[PDB]
Design a protein around this nucleic acid. Structure first.
Ligand SMILES: Nc1ncnc2c1ncn2[C@@H]1O[C@H](COP(=O)(O)OP(=O)(O)OP(=O)(O)O)[C@@H](O)[C@H]1O
Length: 417
RNA sequence: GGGCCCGUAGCUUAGCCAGGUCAGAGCGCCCGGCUCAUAACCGGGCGGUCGAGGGUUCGAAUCCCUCCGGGCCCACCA
């Protein structure tokens, strides 16, 4: 007997199925034909800016205890040769079978696949250092996510109960009783979180894709996911599995503290002062700029962000903030932001008398219409509405890796349920 | 004492000095849609009679008179 970590990635299709699903099918075969599957499988989300991602850049791995690693590999290669969309060109699968003892040695790699950008060669190099049995299909871009999935270190993590439909019910649209999910959220939240967007009315955990996935509930315990699991009404649940994921951890973010430049296709946490004030563009798309330890940084607050814009617009030149987000097209697409300090803002106004006064020459104060005389203008402090604290985008906007403010222990949280 | 600017839906604005689809548009808002691929025109709807008053004309947001409100400049007196 031996302990081997199986890792899989890039196997789905635009029109195809899910990668967690194929890992479940392989698991079943391992469980009854080769040995046992130890504990909960793992869904490790990686760099959410990769262009190759089919929709979320999620990779899968699971511990196994088989008698002979050779058969194991064949068995898994098979499940791929049958349930993997090898047809598409956006799908280049890869599988890894690393010995448990060796998993740890991959934390640096997985880490680099989550926060930065890697290359197929880099994955093949790791494989080459420990002669890790692997499966490279076509290009094999999957070997990246595969290794990562196994090496990814979870110091923090959330759980996710994923239920799949019956095969015949595929393609067709899912049938379910919405209202049951709110009863569910209204009864288990925060425990189970990011499952519904009230102030935007939506059920996020229920996809609308070709994927076998019926629904997918996130929580902080099996207890919650369990209570939730039965406390909901939907079509009959065929297969179902609970995954340990780095979902809602911010494992992708890079503190400014730890780097010099800021490259595109990466995410960070920065502090800065609004140099240029907020502003829209067709579609409800808000933008602004902050002065940073790097220079002039621009922040995007796209429409899908909803109620977030209602806060961002309130930002004024000179405010101190902390922006969390990924950078693409040289901009930081806000996922959440902290309002550290607010800059007061005054206004110049011409005096009165009867009524208001005008300007009498460049250096000659102001005179009435009311025939009077005054020297200075009416300066006034304009109280703001915006307030310091942490503001995040709404549930329906959340990105898998994005840590919801409900999980963070910081004061000044304005939570959007 | 004189000389200018500017005011079109809640904002920001086309059109205005070539007056005859008297009202276009982006944001907002109301209402939907997409998606648990951070996402640079996703939609529909309501919404202005064009600062106020007045005059010319077959007719003005659109040319003229003046007023309200914003705001500016040059001189003079001292
Ligand atoms: N940091 C990275 N650098 C380079 N390539 C990466 C990186 N992270 C992931 N990849 C590659 O991006 C591709 C993602 O494809 P994949 O099909 O896994 O998307 P998915 O969104 O995970 O699919 P699904 O969510 O439907 O199961 C894989 O080849 C993965 O190896």
């Amino acid at each position: 007997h031996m302990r081997v970590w199986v890792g899989i990635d890039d196997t789905d299709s635009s029109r195809g199925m899910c990668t967690t699903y194929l890992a479940v099918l392989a698991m079943e075969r391992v469980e009854r034909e080769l040995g046992k599957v130890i504990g909960f499988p793992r869904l490790i989300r990686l760099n959410p800016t990769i262009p190759y991602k089919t929709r979320g850049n999620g990779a899968v791995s699971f511990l196994v205890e088989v008698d002979d690693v050779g058969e194991l590999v064949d068995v898994v290669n098979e499940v791929i040769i049958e349930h993997a969309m090898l047809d598409d060109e956006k799908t280049n699968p890869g599988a890894v079978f690393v010995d448990e003892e060796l998993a740890v040695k991959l934390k640096p790699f997985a880490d680099k696949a989550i926060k930065d950008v890697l290359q197929i060669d880099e994955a093949l190099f790791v494989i080459g250092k420990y002669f890790i049995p692997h499966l490279r299909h076509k290009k094999g871009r999957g070997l990246i996510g595969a290794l990562a999935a196994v090496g990814a270190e979870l110091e923090d993590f959330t759980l996710e109960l994923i239920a799949y439909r019956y095969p015949e019910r595929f393609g067709t649209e899912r049938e379910y009783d919405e209202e049951s999910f709110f009863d569910m959220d209204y009864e288990l939240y925060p425990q189970t979180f990011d499952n519904v967007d009230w102030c935007n009315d939506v059920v996020v955990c229920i996809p609308n894709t070709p994927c076998p996935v019926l629904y997918g509930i996130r929580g902080e315990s099996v207890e919650a996911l369990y209570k939730a699991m039965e406390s909901v009404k939907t079509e009959p649940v065929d297969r179902r599995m609970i995954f340990v994921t780095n979902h809602a951890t911010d494992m992708h973010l890079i503190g400014e503290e730890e780097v010099h430049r800021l490259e595109n296709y990466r995410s960070y946490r920065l502090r800065g002062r609004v140099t240029l004030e907020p502003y829209d563009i067709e579609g409800g798309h808000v933008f602004f700029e902050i002065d940073t330890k790097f220079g002039s940084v621009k922040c995007a607050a796209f429409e899908p962000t909803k109620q977030f814009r209602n806060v961002i617009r309130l930002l004024r030149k000179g405010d101190v903030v902390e922006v969390y987000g990924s950078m693409k097209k040289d901009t930081i697409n806000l996922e959440k932001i902290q309002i550290v300090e607010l800059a007061e803002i005054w206004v110049e106004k011409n005096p009165i008398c009867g009524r208001r006064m005008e300007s009498a020459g460049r250096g000659q104060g102001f005179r009435c219409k009311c025939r009077t005389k005054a020297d200075e203008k009416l300066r006034e402090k304009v109280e703001r509405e915006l307030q310091p604290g942490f503001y995040e985008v709404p549930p329906s906007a959340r990105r898998h890796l994005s840590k919801p403010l409900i999980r963070m222990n910081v004061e000044g949280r304005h939570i959007f349920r």
